[PDB]
Amino acid sequence: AQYEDGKQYTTLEKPVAGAPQVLEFFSFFCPHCYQFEEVLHISDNVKKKLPEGVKMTKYHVNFMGGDLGKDLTQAWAVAMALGVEDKVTVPLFEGVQKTQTIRSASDIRDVFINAGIKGEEYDAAWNSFVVKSLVAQQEKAAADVQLRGVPAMFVNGKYQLNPQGMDTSNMDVFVQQYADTVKYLSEK
Numbered sequence: 001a002q003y004e005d006g007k008q009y010t011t012l013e014k015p016v017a018g019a020p021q022v023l024e025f026f027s028f029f030c031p032h033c034y035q036f037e038e039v040l041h042i043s044d045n046v047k048k049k050l051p052e053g054v055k056m057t058k059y060h061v062n063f064m065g066g067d068l069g070k071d072l073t074q075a076w077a078v079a080m081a082l083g084v085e086d087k088v089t090v091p092l093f094e095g096v097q098k099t100q101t102i103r104s105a106s107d108i109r110d111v112f113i114n115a116g117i118k119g120e121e122y123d124a125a126w127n128s129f130v131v132k133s134l135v136a137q138q139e140k141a142a143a144d145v146q147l148r149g150v151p152a153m154f155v156n157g158k159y160q161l162n163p164q165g166m167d168t169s170n171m172d173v174f175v176q177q178y179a180d181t182v183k184y185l186s187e188k
Contacts, residue, residue, distance in 0.1 A: 007165045008181045012158055016144045019157025020057035022050065022182065025142060028072050028096045029064035030150045037093055040175050042151075049179045050186060058085070059138040061150055065096075071105045072096075077134035078112070078125045087115040155185040 005011050024043060026033040036042040047056055060076035062069050072092070079085045091111045095102035102108055112122050125131055145154060153161040166177045 003181065003184050007162065008177070009155075009159045009162050009165075009185060012145060012154075012160060016154075016157030019144070019154065020141070021054050021156055022046065022056045022186070023141060023154040023157075024056065024058040025061055025147055025150050025152040025154075026058065027061050027064040027069065027150050028092045028102075029069060031097065033151045034093050034097050036151045037089060040171060042175060042178060045175050045179045046153075046182045049183045051183070054186065057141075059141055061142050061147065062139065063148070064150070068096075068103070068105075068108075071108055073138055074126065074131065074135055075105075075108045075112070077131045077138065078122065080134055081125050081128070081131055082117060082121070084112070084115065084117055087117075088112055091115065153182065155182060155188075159185045159188070161185075 003009070026036070043056065043058060050056070060073040062073050065072065075088075075092070076085075079088050088111055091114065092102070092108070095107065095111055102111070109122060109126075113119060144157075145152075145160070151163075155161075161178065161181060163174075163178060166174055166181070168174050
């Protein structure tokens with residue numbers, strides 16, 4: 001076939017019921033995740049080819065960057081609760097990987113302040129039980145597929161994208177293959 005299990009995707013041994021339709025995992029410490037966000041705009045190109053009625057979910061993970069990795073998962077929960085993902089994603093990636101100016105929770109906080117979220121509003125979110133549960137959801141989703149690497153994408157809790165089995169001479173071609181693969185799995 002043109003799309004083959006073990007080539008552009010793999011199938012989970014143990015499917016996950018009730019899972020988000022399109023579920024993406026990343027870390028601000030993850031170098032390919034940086035590429036996926038800033039150079040390839042994967043999430044965006046996937047969305048544009050996804051059918052209507054389909055929601056996309058993106059979660060942060062703990063297993064990179066130790067203590068700061070965890071702070072970053074809580075900050076992404078904050079971002080999700082306030083709906084400010086699209087204003088903090090780039091400065092978080094660059095602060096962690098490019099300028100290396102994020103070294104503490106306070107520095108993560110500075111990124112939000114500079115993006116215009118109010119101190120009072122950020123700290124209230126940071127400490128809220130709504131953010132606690134949102135952190136819990138991020139962890140449980142990763143645990144459900146026993147995630148040990150990012151970037152990662154899962155479609156309907158059953159299929160996992162396999163970018164290693166796609167061509168990388170051309171960044172544009174890679175992205176479309178990736179997105180078309182998501183769509184095919186979507187329709188499966």
